Amino acid sequence: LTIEVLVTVDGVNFRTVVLNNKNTYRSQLGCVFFNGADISDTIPDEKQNGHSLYLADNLTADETKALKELYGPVDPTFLHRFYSLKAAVHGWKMVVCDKVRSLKLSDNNCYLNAVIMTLDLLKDIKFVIPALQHAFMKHKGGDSTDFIALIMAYGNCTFGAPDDASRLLHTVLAKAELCCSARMVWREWCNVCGIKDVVLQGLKACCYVGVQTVEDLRARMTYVCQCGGERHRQLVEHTTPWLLLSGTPNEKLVTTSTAPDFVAFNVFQGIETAVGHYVHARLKGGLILKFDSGTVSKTSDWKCKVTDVLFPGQKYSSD
């Protein structure tokens, strides 16, 4: 005959739809997920009678704003991509390597291993979006499927394809906030326009794309001013619990004997004009722990192309 189903986006608000057993879910309603599986192209039967379904296509007006409440300001394709990506990465595994968790290699997800393992070191961050923060807490508890899929959905990552660990890592952190104070003050001046200080606080004072050493971050910068002259900018105060600097792959010789100041970094292997490979590295006990997608190996010395570099807390004041 006909079944009644509960349609939800939030799990606490439901809409009743009655369907026939003559057409598929996709033609009668849209794309639906039942217990994490896609059943849009199946015919409704009594097994789903009286059960809740997670709808992705053709959201109603109220379900759309409930969606913006749960996931933030997302586009209409977002919910379908997240639901599909989540069941696609069902087979993926977090493997314990030397007391920490690393993403086993599967379907070109090595960039995700670099992103997640870097995020796992930032133990002072929180997400403002409720669905993202929930998946983050589930990840830290041992179930990472939700977090992985949401990260890929917010990042516009296509399944099974390589991508950019730096871009995704900083895109994710743009949605986060710091649980302590942090602050960086820039001084900008132009001989015609004058001088002015710019202040950033919170987690935005802890990430920067464009340099890969603290010395380069602290150097003077010069660029065209709105008046046409040359404007300068220089870091003048910096207090943070950590510092994440990212740039293009840059070959360096990482060495324990000199005892470097950074605590972790990411490496791109290969040439940048082609599909390469990511490794996540950490400094512990006078060695470099190299986390390569569920495997770990250790070296005192490593010539490698660095992308992201994680430094400890900053305490700086100049001029």
Binding site: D164, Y208, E272, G276
Partner: protein, 78 residues
């Protein structure tokens, strides 16, 4: 509500002018850069003052002013 002129710089260090509106999306600016530079949208991402530009957000949310310098970043594939 009129447009303003910002700058996007490529990998080689060359800055080009773009007429934009603060209400337009980053995705819309990425299409302008893609046309001028000759590189598809999913091959690069934009940063301003060390921060990434999210595609679906409007430019006004990043404090762009006339002759602000946005950086073009190659999107690696690892």
């Amino acid at each position: 509500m009129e447009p303003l002129s910002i700058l996007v710089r490529n990998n080689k260090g060359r800055s080009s002018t773009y007429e934009v509106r603060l209400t337009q999306t980053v995705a819309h600016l990425k299409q302008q850069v893609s046309g001028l530079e000759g590189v598809q949208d999913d091959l690069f991402w934009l940063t301003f003052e060390g921060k990434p530009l999210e595609d679906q957000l409007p430019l006004g949310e990043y404090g762009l002013k006339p002759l602000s310098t946005v950086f073009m970043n190659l999107r690696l594939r690892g």
